[PDB]
Each structure stands twice: as C-alpha cells, then as structure tokens.
Design a protein around this ligand. Structure first.
Ligand SMILES: NC(=O)c1ccc[n+]([C@@H]2O[C@H](COP(=O)([O-])OP(=O)(O)OC[C@H]3O[C@@H](n4cnc5c(N)ncnc54)[C@H](OP(=O)(O)O)[C@@H]3O)[C@@H](O)[C@H]2O)c1
Ligand SMILES: NC(=O)c1ccc[n+]([C@@H]2O[C@H](COP(=O)([O-])OP(=O)(O)OC[C@H]3O[C@@H](n4cnc5c(N)ncnc54)[C@H](OP(=O)(O)O)[C@@H]3O)[C@@H](O)[C@H]2O)c1
Ligand SMILES: CCCSc1nc(N2CCC[C@@H](CC(=O)O)C2)ccc1C(=O)NC1CCCCC1
Ligand SMILES: CCCSc1nc(N2CCC[C@@H](CC(=O)O)C2)ccc1C(=O)NC1CCCCC1
Lengths: 255, 253
C-alpha cells in the first residue's frame, strides 16, 4: 500500500541524521523528493549529508547543528526548521547519546544523560512540533529498539530510556485517539542494525538501508508499531497481543 | 512456600511508607518482627506509622523524612538507614510523586519530576544499597503498575516512569545473573488498589492490605515479577512469554 509519491513535497524533520539509520532515512526522503531538515551535533558531517540529499532530488535540504542535552535548542530547532519548510508533515525522532556495552555500577550521570537525550528531548521536540503537526494532520515517528521492549544486560540506561518512550508515546497515542487529535504516533522496534556505531559497540545485523525505508513506510502508513529484525522468529515474537487486549479491554469499557 | 518467620529479625527499608500500600507493607513487616526504616515527605505521619509498627511487634522501627527529588537525600538515607539496622536485607522502592489523571499538553516539568521521583531516585537508592545487599544476599523490590506494562490515557508521565523502571531493573537483573551478584530484583505489577490516593485520583479496586502482603511475599520468595489485580482474567493476561523467549534467545552466547 506504500507509494514513494506519498513523500513527494512533504516537510520532514529527521533527528540524529549525521550518521547511521538517521542519515539513511534522510537520503530515502530525498530520493522521494521531500523537503528535509536534518540535525546532529556535527556541522561538517551534516553539511555532507545535506548536499548529498540535494544530489538525490530533495525538494530542499537543510541542517541545524546542536545538542539535544540542551532543551532550549530542541525547542528553537523545531521553530527554525518549521520556518524553513513553512510547516511540518512528519517528525522523525531518532537521535541517541553515546553509550558503550558495559555492566552497570554507579554511573547515575549516564542514566540521567540518556534519559535527557533519548527521552525528554523527544517529549520537548513533540510539544514544540504539535501545533504544526495538527495543521497538516501529521505524523510522529519514534525510533526505539528490541532493548526497549525486552531486557538485555549491558544496556540498562539505554533500555530505561527506550522503555520510557514506549510508555509516554503509547499513552499520548491513546489521548490523541480520545481527544480526536489527527496526529499519528509510530513506535519502531528494531533489532541490531549494521550501523558503524552498532558494529563497533557490539550476531547478524540487518541492512541500514532497508531499516531506514521501513521506518519511513510505517510512519507514512500511520502504523502504531514498526518491526525490523534480521530474523523471522524475532519479528513473530515482537508483538504483545495480551497488552493489546489489556489496553483495548479498558477503552471498550470507558471512553 | 512463604512463612512469616522468613521476615523475623530482617533489616528492611520501605519508601513511600507515610500512606497507601507503603504504610501497609511497613505494618505487615512489623507484625512479622522485622527491623524497619520508613521514609516519606510527611514527618508527623511517619511518626504515627513508626509507633504503630512498634505496637505490632517490630524488632525496631525508625523513620527519615525527606524528598526523593533530592538525589543526595536518597544517598544519605540509605547510609543512615543502613547504620541504624547494622545492614540491609530488603529494599522496598515504592514512592511516587503526586499526579492527576489529566490529558498531556506541555507540562515538561511534570514529565521531569515524575522521571526524577519515580525512576531516578529508585536507581540512586539501589546504587547506595547494593554493597549492603551484596553482604546479606538481599532483595530489591520495585513497585510498578499495569500502567507500567500497558498503555492507558491520562497517565503519560507516570507510565513513562514505570516503563523506565522495567527496562532498567529488568536489564540489571540480567547483569546480576551473568556477574553472579546474589541480589534478587522483584518487579510488582499492580492493577487499581483501594488507596486514598487512587480513590481520589480516579471503580472496584483491590484491597491494599493483601496487596501489601503479596509484594513482601514475592520479594521474600525472590520472584522476578509479582502480579496483584482484582481480576483473575487480567492476571492471566499479564505474563509475556514471547519477551522471555527473546531475552533467553540472547543469553547463549
Ligand atoms: N543500530 C542498531 O543496532 C540499533 C538497534 C535498535 C535501535 N536502534 C535505534 O536507532 C536509532 C539510530 O541509531 P544508529 O545506529 O543510527 O546510531 P548512530 O549512528 O550513533 O546515530 C546517532 C545519531 O545521533 C547523533 N547524536 C549523538 N549525540 C547527540 C546529541 N547529544 N544531540 C543530538 N544528536 C546527537 C549522532 O551524531 P552527532 O555525533 O553528529 O551528534 C548521530 O547522527 C537510535 O534511536 C537507536 O536507539 C539502533
Ligand atoms: N493504588 C493503586 O491504584 C496503584 C496502582 C498501581 C501501582 N501502584 C503503585 O503502588 C505504590 C504505592 O502507591 P499508593 O497508591 O499507595 O500511593 P500513595 O498513597 O500516594 O503513597 C506514595 C508514597 O510516596 C510518598 N511520596 C510522594 N511524593 C514523594 C516525594 N517527592 N518524595 C518522597 N516520597 C514521596 C508519599 O508520602 P509523602 O507525601 O508523605 O512524601 C507516600 O507515602 C506506587 O509505586 C504506585 O505506583 C498503586
Ligand atoms: C546485548 C546487546 C543489547 S543492545 C541491542 N540488543 C539487541 N538484541 C540482543 C542481541 C541480539 C539481537 C538480535 C536481533 O537483532 O534480533 C537483539 C537488539 C538491539 C540492541 C540495540 O538497540 N543496541 C544498541 C546499543 C547501543 C547503541 C545502538 C544499538
Ligand atoms: C486510566 C487510569 C490509569 S491509572 C491505572 N490504571 C489501571 N487500569 C486502568 C483502569 C482499570 C484498571 C483495572 C485493573 O485493576 O485491572 C487497570 C491500573 C493501575 C493504574 C495506576 O497505576 N493508577 C495510579 C494512577 C496515579 C495515582 C496512583 C494510582
């Protein structure tokens, strides 16, 4: 049911687009002829991405460098991006703070930083974007992980942040349903992807290029969840039908 | 296989014990003859709770009033509590910041406060308690909710904080398994309970007295999860076998 034309002329923010899945998403949106605003801390890598976007046939491509540790930057970023495109059709929240695979001892500053960059900054970006997304009847895409659905050692702070995104966005999705806010929320559950970050930090990784295209497709098709894993078995097990029943058994009782 | 005597003479911290489930847990541990240290913001209420604990037959009962927004208080409390009892056998993390069941608009300070009180403070308390819990081969009890497993409207910040507890504690449980740290982690998934807080905020809720005894029982029996709900049907639906399989799929390795 997805057609690349669905993205032609669309106004899209992609966070964490200097590298990995983010950079790949920005390139796919460009090949489809969308207006893209990209961000990361690194100005020079961002520049290279923006020019390559214009080479692929993007309607427009821009960058705004900054840290998502700074909540005022998150706020002002959406404002300038919106100004550049004259509005916003899709918000792709994808960035993450640097983490290493390590046992948890006492790094409370690291738990805080992850919670700030990976979680609160997503909430702050959403609040800022919500008036524009309401106008266009837009979409919010939240890039999560299997580590944000299930428990693995070595990723406690990261898992906590990804789990937090599920609780927050999944609850606001129920609120938008009742409030009749026509803004879709897509949560992406990915397994290990072949990004240079992941490859160095860590089985069989899945291709970054297809992963990127799937995230966009899911968002465009207004899906609640998107699954992307190198295994058939893992994808079958990602789904939580009891959760759905539990959730739906409340709504079909009060609403 | 639970016996009340398993708690006799045991050293236990109970957070959020001025009211609700927390206060009830503190009373149950008191009837079993345990050493209890209780905490909350409310000093005059904690006093009344402590004296009632000693009336029920607690080996000792003490309190330390303070706010879990303050991370240094969280740190200081565990040392102070650990000094009072000469060690720690069980850590019951139960407190929550005040929330109302409203639609989310733009209250970022509220998302932050919930994340700090309901989540960060639990992590800070754990880090502080871990050396003592290692000595006794202790237990950490994390009080969560169904709203921390499943999605409901009107509780976004609260859900985020409860979901975060699951990811963090469930991952550290895997780390303690590989590191061979003999400290158990119990996550409690509760439905509505008949506490004044809940009866004011939001409805056939489950009794707080039995809820309180179950949390303790689960912790004592070193269970990974504890379920407590007024519905048998809901209870059946809480288990996630696919998650378990995905988790163990990795383990080997
Ligand atoms: N790769 C996998 O195996 C995998 C698996 C499951 C889920 N995911 C999820 O997929 C998403 C993309 O990950 P990825 O593999 O593409 O990782 P990545 O290559 O490390 O990309 C992270 C991006 O965030 C940026 N960033 C870092 N710190 C930042 C900060 N403080 N403020 C703003 N931006 C910051 C990075 O660039 P700068 O350094 O230029 O700031 C980069 O553009 C993440 O949400 C991740 O959790 C990935
Ligand atoms: N009752 C339910 O329907 C329900 C449902 C699911 C899960 N649960 C879980 O069960 C636990 C107990 O809930 P409850 O209904 O018994 O709630 P409660 O009566 O409101 O008790 C929460 C406790 O936390 C303390 N507290 C509040 N803000 C604090 C702060 N900033 N710093 C330190 N302590 C603070 C309160 O004391 P002060 O104001 O004196 O500080 C109180 O003793 C929670 O983890 C809750 O999520 C309950
Ligand atoms: C012990 C590794 C935990 S991290 C992690 N584990 C995942 N598992 C466990 C290993 C096998 C794997 C198999 C699969 O693809 O089905 C599924 C899947 C995704 C992540 C993840 O999002 N990793 C981050 C870490 C920080 C940097 C970004 C990437
Ligand atoms: C829409 C209400 C969401 S709050 C909430 N809902 C729960 N549900 C939804 C209603 C029906 C209920 C039925 C059940 O027992 O199976 C299951 C269960 C627990 C909570 C909860 O943790 N409550 C907190 C809120 C803040 C104050 C402290 C208590």
């Amino acid at each position: 049911e997805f057609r690349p034309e669905m993205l032609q002329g669309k106004k899209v923010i992609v966070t964490g687009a200097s590298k990995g899945i983010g950079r790949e998403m920005a390139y796919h949106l460009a090949k489809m002829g969308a207006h893209v605003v990209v961000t990361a801390r690194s100005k020079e890598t961002l520049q290279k991405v923006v020019s390559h976007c214009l080479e692929l046939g993007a309607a427009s491509a821009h960058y705004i460098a900054g840290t998502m540790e700074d909540m005022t930057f998150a706020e002002q970023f959406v404002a300038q991006a919106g100004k550049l495109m004259g509005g916003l059709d899709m918000l792709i929240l994808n960035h993450i703070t640097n983490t290493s695979l390590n046992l948890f001892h006492d790094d409370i500053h690291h738990v805080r930083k992850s919670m700030e960059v990976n979680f609160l900054s997503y909430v702050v970006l959403t609040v800022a974007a919500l008036p524009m997304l309401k106008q266009s009847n837009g979409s919010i895409v939240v890039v999560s992980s299997l580590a944000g659905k299930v428990a693995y050692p070595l990723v406690a702070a990261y898992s906590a942040s990804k789990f937090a995104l599920d609780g927050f966005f999944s609850s606001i999705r129920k609120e938008y349903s009742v409030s009749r806010v026509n803004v879709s929320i897509t949560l992406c559950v990915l397994g290990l992807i072949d990004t240079e970050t992941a490859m160095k930090a860590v089985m069989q990784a899945a291709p970054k290029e297809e992963c990127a295209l799937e995230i966009i497709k899911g968002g465009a098709l207004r899906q609640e969840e998107v699954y992307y894993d190198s295994s058939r078995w893992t994808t079958l097990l990602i789904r939580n039908p009891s959760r759905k029943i539990l959730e739906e058994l409340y709504s079909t009782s009060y609403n």
